[PDB]
Write a protein that binds this ligand. Structure first.
Ligand code: NAD
Ligand code: NAD
Ligand code: O45
Ligand code: O45
Ligand code: MG
Lengths: 358, 358
């Protein structure tokens, strides 16, 4: 009789669309295995800018505080380009959210599904080898949050700046999260930095290496961010855990999403040291397809399939949604973003096919 | 006939190996096209460390000060991991060289040669659409040179930091180079930033946008760095000029190199406002293969071609090198990096074959 409380935040763009299908798939999971979910929905992002007037209004932050997990869509859109930097949906809501709940550990699992190599935009012989990867991205530190940042001066000497700064304890905790995930997988961690140039990357590399002494079963490799970007295309199969800074993990996880077939595949979990977890798709609000019922809901759906995994240890419920996405796709069903030409289904139609595989 | 004075800084790892082939190609190009190069060789990087105790000896910097152009291989490797940050080949030699000669404009032309699509690691239908773009990368500013940078504190409170800082004049001159490049190509500039988060990217985007008013014949599009990483895989054909910060250009250009088939294919030019140039492969010293005579010399050879073109306007000589490369590849010869189930030619064989095709 487990009754948990989710604070659903849909956001902007394809946010509200794919969020409906995530609920759809859940409700079947609820009455299928035996638990309740009490979905309380709030406004965040540019939506909260004309339904409250502020990207993260007090009410919204309050609902999260009271839930056992936040289900999240995405924010951002061209409508809010021209607000001040601090008051847009990205700096105004999402980055604050992450910092407020100290959600330092970002998990983005990217895998090529059995027999789905058609989706993969790589060459057939590369895609054949398949791949199964988890990006462990430091989420609350680094250049996205560092101080100082701002703009000063005038004219051609106007100067703008951001600070890629890390404190050792921030590196230690995300590194631990990486080695623990590796222990539960294939015992390989690839740490990605630019330690031949950046001072912060030198500290990253040294701390990760120190941390490795508490995990002698894990193989630790170090690679530079520019090389990482080739290796993902050339040998995606050689990766297990990808340990990354905030900005490098941002970059690398989209590349990984693409090689699995689309941005619409990659789910994500953002967890703090307590296990409290926000669950959003890795990608953004996709303005160019927002409002049209064409948008892969898999990433949003599988997110909740991670929420019941990590926030609530309900493995059978999570293994359900996951093998239900595998079966719909195994049957040749589909949204437009994925390769192969055959009448795509809408977001709704993908939501249903999957809710049915439940 | 007066010679041009070429400082040859082959460096570490595969550097000496591929530089030897560039010199062999250049000697034949000199005969066939009537011009004279005076090669003066200098130690740099790890090799200079082993000879002098210094990664950038005063003798080497003198040599470059006295040269008409610099032909550079690559620096760095495992032998030097444990040196103090400022003695290492990369911070101690390459970055200072770029900074000393004010080589703000980095040009990396990535092209998939018509007929070599089996080399491209993208899916065959994607690779069929073609790929021909040039990264225009700001090379002397941004996080790789910003201050403050360093490390402070101790224990878990140790912090390390680097500053991504741009002045408007730095963005203006690199933006201008990208729009001029676009004017000679297909009149599209795609500018890469992270303007939804970074103050420095906001200034980047604003300044590029304002520079575009000077180029009504050119399309300007703005894309986020994480998304750019996907678009290169999904739609390589859509790119013409890719305008990037120092670190973002560093990152994306390795991905561009890989989709042309190998890091070993991508040459580069680094130019200051007076047109003085340093020419080097875009990639590193390849320590995993260094000394085995298997590295692809094409990047170094095409770097020498850019030298002739950009430093000396010997355009016919540079065209011949490019065509000789394409003919050898069309004839089925390939080094081990170029995907094929044939016996690969060595580094020195590839150089000889290119030389004979001049
Ligand atoms: N998590 C977030 O809230 C977050 C993260 C990234 C970007 N954004 C915001 O999103 C907006 C657009 O940014 P972007 O275009 O660089 O990133 P994006 O991820 O939104 O889109 C990149 C490309 O992938 C496609 N795509 C993304 N999700 C898809 C899905 N579910 N199904 C099918 N296609 C999908 C888009 O159509 C687009 O072509 C911006 O305002 C940005 O600030 C928000
Ligand atoms: N301009 C420079 O001097 C420069 C630039 C980048 C890296 N580096 C240094 O190079 C060293 C290696 O760095 P890395 O491994 O990240 O980058 P890398 O570019 O040297 O190698 C990346 C991968 O590409 C392969 N590769 C590169 N050039 C090749 C060629 N000519 N033919 C066949 N394969 C090739 C390598 O074998 C490796 O597997 C490091 O010390 C790094 O600091 C130097
Ligand atoms: C929404 C932002 C603050 C930009 O951050 N971007 C990501 O997390 C991503 O692109 O995955
Ligand atoms: C050797 C360095 C100073 C690191 O720089 N790396 C690049 O410039 C690249 O990947 O091109
Ligand atoms: Mg690079």
């Amino acid at each position: 009789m487990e009754s948990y409380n989710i604070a659903v935040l849909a956001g902007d763009g394809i946010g509200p669309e794919v969020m409906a299908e995530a609920i759809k798939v859940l409700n079947r999971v609820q009455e299928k295995f035996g638990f309740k979910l009490n979905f309380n929905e709030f406004f965040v992002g540019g939506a909260a800018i004309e339904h409250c007037g502020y990207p993260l209004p007090a009410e919204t932050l309050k609902g999260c505080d009271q839930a056992d997990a936040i289900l999240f869509g995405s924010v951002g859109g061209p409508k809010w380009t021209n607000l001040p930097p601090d008051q847009q949906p990205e700096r105004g809501a999402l980055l604050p959210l992450r910092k407020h709940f100290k959600l330092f550990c970002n998990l983005r699992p990217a895998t090529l599904y059995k027999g789905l190599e058609k989706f993969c935009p790589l060459r057939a012989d590369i895609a054949a080898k398949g791949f199964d990867m988890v990006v462990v991205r430091e989420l609350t530190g680094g250049i996205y949050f560092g101080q100082p940042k701002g703009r000063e001066g005038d004219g051609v000497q106007t100067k703008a700046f951001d600070t890629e700064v890390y404190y050792k304890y921030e590196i230690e905790r995300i590194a631990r999260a990486a080695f623990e995930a590796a222990m539960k997988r294939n015992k390989k961690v690839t740490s990605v930095d630019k330690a031949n140039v950046l001072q912060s990357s030198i500290l990253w590399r040294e701390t990760v290496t120190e941390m490795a002494k508490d995990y002698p079963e894990v193989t630790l490799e170090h690679i530079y961010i520019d090389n990482a970007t080739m290796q993902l295309i050339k040998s995606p199969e050689s990766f297990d855990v990808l340990l990354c800074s905030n900005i490098f993990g941002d970059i690398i996880s989209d590349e990984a999403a693409m090689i699995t077939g689309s941005m619409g595949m990659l789910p994500s979990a953002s967890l703090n040291e307590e296990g409290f977890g926000l669950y959003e798709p890795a990608g953004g609000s996709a303005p160019d397809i927002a409002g049209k019922g064409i948008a892969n809901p898999i990433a949003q759906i599988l997110s909740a399939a991670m929420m019941l995994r990590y926030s609530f240890n309900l493995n059978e419920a999570a293994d359900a949604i996951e093998s239900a996405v595998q079966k719909v796709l195994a049957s040749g069903h589909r949204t437009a973003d994925l390769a192969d030409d055959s009448t795509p289904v809408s977001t709704a139609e993908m939501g249903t096919l999957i809710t049915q595989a439940i």
